[PDB]
């Protein structure tokens, strides 16, 4: 079924196969499957999503932060300086339980203190002196 | 050590602590000629089945025995040449003893040498063990002795001995004989008592004939030196032992 779709785009419909159909594709681990598929035939741009930058993560933290509350007393970027390149996907995580931690004690109003907490919630527990190398 | 295992190469203790490259050897000697060693009450005597494998062989021409410096008789079994090797070491080292300490060689300290040269061919990886089962017995001021030899070095001091393809057969008589003689026989009479063995042991191999040879060493008969026996002595024996087994 990979052998057919590869040809389904070529030499029988190939005059019009990829004419006006304009596929995309989303994966991980590009370096294990066939090299037949990634090539200019059937593909154009092996483009890439790295983790974000410090400036990126501020935006992405500011945006799942929308609907929370009539908050105050915040500078929501220094958290990004607390937090190295992890993802622009998990930060909703630390954006989430910050509310929960205050929800846990019923103050619907929020604080910077919780962001300091929830950020440390995830990876400090997700953590060998054999440095034979120099 | 059945396959994908350990028996193939030396100095690898199989997990029951064994060198299965060794215990293959004792089957080799078990697949060889017969020979014996007896303690007279005043010395020793040996024997062997020489093996006619053809008609073109000459009596008293190709022995199966060598000898130590002056006294210590030594026999072979299983494989001859590997035996012949260390007997060159036998005559060798005993001269290093004699030149140095100004006397002949005692037999216990002798095995203290020859019971290690073979042991020191067990422990490496790039050698083979001597596929034999040797015997040597002799005389000294402290009396006489007999020593059997196993390739792993498990040499003890016997009064009677055996090897070859006729062990349980032969050694039975050696046990069934000695209990009837706690005295310990003198020399000339144990001879025919032993030739009784070989013309009985060969019962396995009745496809063929054979012959034998004899050793001799005692105080009252050689001053305690080694030699063979000829003339009417052993000829009076071979017919005797052949006479009293029919």
């Amino acid at each position: 079924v990979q052998r057919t779709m590869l040809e389904l785009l070529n030499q029988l419909d190939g005059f019009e196969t990829s004419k006006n159909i304009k596929i995309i594709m989303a994966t991980n681990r590009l370096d294990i499957l066939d090299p037949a598929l990634l090539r200019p035939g059937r593909i154009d741009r092996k483009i890439e999503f790295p983790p974000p930058s410090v400036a990126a993560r501020a935006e992405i933290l500011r945006i799942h932060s929308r609907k929370m509350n009539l908050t105050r007393g915040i500078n929501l970027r220094k958290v990004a300086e607390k937090m190295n390149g992890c993802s622009g996907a998990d930060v909703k995580g630390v954006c989430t339980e910050a509310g929960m931690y205050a929800l846990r004690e019923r103050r619907i109003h929020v604080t910077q203190e919780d962001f300091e907490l929830a950020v440390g919630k995830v990876m400090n527990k997700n953590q060998s002196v054999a440095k034979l190398f120099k | 050590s059945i396959g994908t295992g350990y028996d193939l190469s030396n100095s690898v203790f199989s997990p029951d602590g064994r060198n299965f490259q060794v215990e293959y050897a004792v089957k080799a000697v078990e697949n060889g000629t017969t020979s014996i060693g007896i303690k007279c009450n005043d010395g020793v005597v040996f024997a062997v089945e020489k093996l006619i494998t053809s008609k073109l062989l000459v009596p008293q021409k190709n022995v199966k025995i060598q000898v130590v410096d002056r006294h210590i008789g030594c026999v072979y079994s299983g494989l001859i040449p590997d035996g012949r090797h260390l007997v060159n070491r036998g005559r060798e080292e005993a001269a290093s003893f004699k030149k140095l300490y100004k006397t002949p060689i005692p037999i216990p300290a002798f095995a203290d040498r020859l019971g290690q040269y073979v042991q020191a061919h067990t422990l490496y990886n790039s050698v083979r063990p001597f596929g034999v089962s040797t015997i040597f017995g002799g005389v000294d001021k402290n009396g006489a002795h007999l020593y059997m030899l196993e390739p792993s070095g498990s040499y003890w001091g016997y009064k009677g001995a055996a090897t070859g393809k006729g062990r349980q057969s032969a050694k039975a008589e050696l046990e069934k004989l000695v209990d009837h003689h706690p005295e310990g026989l003198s020399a000339r009479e144990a001879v025919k008592q032993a030739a009784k063995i070989i013309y009985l042991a060969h019962e396995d191999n009745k496809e063929k004939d054979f012959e034998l040879e004899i050793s001799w060493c005692s105080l009252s008969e050689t001053n305690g030196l080694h030699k063979f026996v000829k003339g009417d002595l052993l000829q009076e024996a071979i017919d005797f032992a052949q006479k009293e087994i029919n």
Binding site: - | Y6, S9, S11, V12, F13, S14, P15, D16, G17, R18, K39, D112, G115, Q116, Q119, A120, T122, L123, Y124, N125, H145, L146, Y147, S152, G153, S154, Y155, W156, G157, Y158, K159, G160, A161, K171, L174, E175, V178
Partner: protein, 238 residues
């Protein structure tokens, strides 16, 4: 490799070979024991005899290497003598060089340290044996030491060895917690012998002769085997 040779460990963090060499020591189903005194020690080793052609004076697991010193082996013989021989040859060195005779401790600081070397450079397989010693030194008194295929040599108050060094000891440590003594009394070289024989037969319950057992005692400028007619002196008890 990793399961055949020695000089490469397992992935785990140990090896497998030498753990076997300890095992061949039990390849003769023999038991032994050794004890102390103010001036005396004892060693013993039950002797088996298959087919009766042997010369039981020639049979021996014991090698009095020198004056002041004594040893007995375990496991098989031929891989023991070479461990005994260079021992004997060594006392022709320490004496000729450092004046006087070897204590045990320097010896079982030495005869082991090369057994370690027999498991770095694997060209020589390690000697298939655990091995003991006895003596009556001058500073520390009658001292015992144990040795082994890899060298955790240790002094002792007493020992136990064979296939059954789990309960023979239990028949012994039972009362060195009671009598409150590493030492043992009845100093003379007889009375301590029956102690060694009575407690083991209490652990075994088998009768003997001079034929099947032996003796070895460390004494000043002395070490030797002897006649074991004193099997009788146990008889007077019950």
């Amino acid at each position: 490799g990793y399961d055949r040779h020695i000089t490469i460990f397992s992935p785990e963090g140990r090896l497998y070979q030498v753990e076997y060499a300890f095992k061949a020591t039990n390849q003769t189903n023999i038991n032994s024991l050794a004890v102390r005194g103010k001036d005396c020690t004892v060693v013993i080793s039950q002797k088996k005899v298959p087919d009766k052609l042997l010369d039981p004076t020639t049979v021996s697991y014991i090698f009095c290497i020198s004056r002041t010193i004594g040893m007995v082996v375990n496991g098989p013989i031929p891989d023991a003598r070479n461990a005994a021989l260079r021992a004997k040859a060594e006392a022709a060195e320490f004496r000729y060089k450092y004046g006087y005779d070897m204590p045990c401790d320097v010896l079982a600081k030495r005869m082991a340290n090369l057994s370690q070397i027999y498991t770095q450079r694997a060209y020589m397989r390690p000697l298939g044996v655990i091995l003991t010693f006895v003596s009556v030194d001058e500073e520390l008194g009658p001292s015992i030491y144990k040795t082994d295929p890899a060298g955790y040599y240790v002094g002792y108050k007493a020992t136990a060895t064979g296939p059954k060094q789990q309960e023979i000891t239990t028949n012994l440590e039972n009362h060195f917690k009671k009598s409150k003594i590493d030492h043992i009394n009845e100093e003379s070289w007889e009375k301590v012998v029956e102690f060694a024989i009575t407690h083991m037969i209490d652990a075994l319950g088998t009768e003997f002769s001079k034929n099947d057992l032996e003796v070895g005692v460390a004494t000043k400028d002395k070490f030797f085997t002897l006649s074991a007619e004193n099997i009788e002196e146990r008889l007077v008890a019950i």
